Every structure is written in C-alpha cells, then in structure tokens.
Design a protein around this ligand. Structure first.
Ligand code: OLO
Length: 350
C-alpha cells in the first residue's frame, strides 16, 4: 500500500496518473482494471501483463504491442499508454492502457437478443476493421465474439492480436490434422485438413461464424474437440463437391473426406428462420468450404446487405504492410524481454 496498489491481492500500479482502480476481471496471466486517466479525466482500461517468465507469453505480448502501436483505426482497440519500470532489470510486469469499453460481443450475446439493425452495423464494423488489418498484410487469427469489444454507443473494436501473423499464402500448406492454437469453434475447415492459417480467408471464415452466432445467439460450429469441429462444419455445408476436393491435393485429408457418408446442405433460412435474406446470402459466401472461393473482406463490405454503410472512401487501409523481424516464432525469452522494453520506450519520460 505504501507505494504500489493492491487489488484483491497482487500488486497493480499505474504511477501518479491512473487512479480509482476498479477490478474489471482477468483471463490468464493478466489482470484488468478500470481506473482514471487523471490527464484525460476518463476511466481507461488497464491490463497487467507479466510474460517474461514464459517465452511464448513474451512473443504474443510483443506482436500484440507492435501491431497495435503501429495500427490506428476506429474499429481496432489501441494502446493509449504502457506502464513499466524505468529499467529492464526492474521490469517484472507491463501495463497497457486502452480505451475502456462497456462489454464484448460474447457477454452481450449471452443475454441480449440482437436486432437486424444491430447485426448489420456490428458486421459492417467487424469488416471495416478487418479490411484495415488485412490491408496491412496482417491476419488476426483469433476472431470470435470475446475479442470484439463494444461500448454503450454500440461502437465495435477488434482486440487481441496475440496470435496475429503477417500473411504468407505461399507457405500455408501442411499435412492433415495439423495442431492449431486459435479458438476451435471459429476455426476454418482447411485448418483440420491442410492449412497453416497463413491466408486471409482464415479470418473471413471466423467472421462468418460470428455473423451466424449474432443471428442465433448460439455458436454455429461448437465442436467438442479438434476433429469434431470439422464434423460440425460438414453437417451444415454438406459434403464438399468434386471441385472443392480437387483443390485439396493432400491425400490424407482428401481420403478422410471421401471416407465420409454424403450429406446434403442444410439451408440457411432453415437454420435462421426470421433472419434477413441479404444477410444469409453474405453468410453463405463467408462460410464457403473452398478457401479460394470464399468472399474477401472488401467484397463482403460491398454486399447489398451492408449497402446503408458501404463507403470505400470511409473504409481506411494501412499506410504500409506489416512484418516482424523474427517470423518463424523461435526467439529467446531474454531478447524478447529486451524488444518489449524498447517497444514500450516511447511512453517513458526520463
Ligand atoms: C482493453 N479493454 C477495454 N475495455 C475493456 C473491458 N470492459 C468492460 C468489461 C468488464 C468485465 C467483463 C467484460 C467487459 N473489459 C476487459 N477485460 C475483462 C475480462 O473480460 N478489457 C477491456
């Protein structure tokens, strides 16, 4: 108490700027708290991060900081500030200050039904942000309701780029049933068949899953485990056609799909009855089995369904593509801590 602040145990400083600390939750190796940007007189959001122990926790922390700091879009959360010790030796944790939000799509969907006007505007915002993210050659890779924060003005902001990668379509193939870290339910089908998740189409499939969940207040493909996820997807889209199967040259995946009993397509309007017809048509294009035929972000924005919002001159793209001077993951826990230290240097006086 005579120095750092304690919130339900554990320390949680902010220096002489953020006050009125109020628990806001947690999640994993990090504690969140609303407070008070005494400078801006607003209650910011502060996440307590301490990854220097786990090497991977350090890389997710770095690219999240790198990406967010270099990005600037109304539909992407930003980093207002970052609190850390003055020395690398003294730095145990790192605090990131971010515009506070009222809730997230996950929590919202848990109790409030969405109106079409609400669904349309949310989708438009998800896609408007994604076009900027993809324009920077970056893939979010973990798009799901819990990563979409909203405030009381219904404004939406994409967050959580801990698993984001710089696109790389040329090095995307891989063998059948290749492990993945991203949230199962919103995982594209090709992930379980022969994709590393290095193409932009991976993000669009996720958004499609979000669209569906917003239409029904329940996850469209809630696969219990890794392979069940694919089984869920196929129960609705039906068996892939000859063409779609041909794109898959990887034999193991192809033979798996072929060993399966044929099943027909489950109609969308039958899955979501009192749901806009134009929306379901966009949902169809998004949840396309073949990654190559899947609609692209800019294409989706120009869909009749989003006509009342579509305005390309008001849908910004990044000043320049993104790249991490490591790409391949592998990088020592120490160095990472050093890189994190310098990446957060701009917020330190002297
Ligand atoms: C960066 N950030 C901005 N607003 C919030 C916020 N706003 C409201 C809030 C409070 C409690 C639960 C969900 C949402 N909650 C969280 N995370 C808490 C873990 O869910 N992070 C935020």
């Amino acid at each position: 108490a005579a120095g750092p602040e304690m919130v339900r145990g554990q320390v949680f400083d902010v220096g002489p700027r953020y006050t009125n600390l109020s628990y806001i939750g947690e999640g994993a190796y990090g504690m969140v708290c609303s407070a008070y940007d005494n400078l801006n007189k607003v209650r910011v959001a502060i996440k307590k991060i301490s990854p220097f122990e786990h090497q991977t926790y350090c890389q997710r922390t770095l690219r999240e900081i790198k990406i967010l700091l270099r990005f600037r879009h109304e539909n992407i959360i930003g980093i207002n500030d970052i609190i850390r010790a003055p020395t690398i030796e003294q730095m145990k944790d790192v605090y990131i200050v971010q515009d506070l939000m009222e809730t997230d799509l996950y929590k919202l969907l848990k109790t409030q039904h969405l109106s079409n006007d609400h669904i349309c505007y949310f989708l438009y915002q998800i896609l408007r942000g994604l076009k900027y993210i993809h324009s920077a050659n970056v893939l979010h890779r973990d798009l799901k309701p819990s990563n979409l924060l909203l405030n009381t003005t219904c404004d939406l902001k994409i967050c959580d780029f801990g698993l984001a990668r710089v696109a790389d379509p040329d090095h995307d193939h891989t063998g059948f049933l290749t492990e993945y870290v991203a949230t199962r339910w919103y995982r594209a089908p090709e992930i379980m068949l022969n994709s590393k998740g290095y193409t932009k189409s991976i993000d669009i499939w996720s958004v499609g899953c979000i669209l569906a969940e917003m239409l029904s207040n329940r996850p469209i493909f809630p696969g219990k485990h890794y392979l069940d996820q694919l089984n869920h997807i196929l129960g609705i889209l039906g068996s892939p056609s000859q063409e779609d199967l041909n794109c898959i040259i990887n034999l193991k995946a192809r033979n798996y799909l072929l060993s399966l009993p044929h099943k027909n397509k489950v109609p969308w309007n039958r899955l979501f009855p009192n749901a806009d017809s134009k929306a379901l048509d966009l949902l169809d294009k998004m949840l396309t089995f073949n990654p190559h035929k899947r609609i692209e972000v800019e294409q989706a924005l120009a869909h009749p369904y989003l006509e009342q919002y579509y305005d390309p001159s008001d849908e910004p793209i990044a000043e320049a593509p993104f790249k991490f001077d490591m790409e391949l993951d592998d990088l020592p826990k120490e160095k990472l801590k050093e890189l994190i230290f310098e990446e957060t240097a701009r917020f330190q006086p002297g």
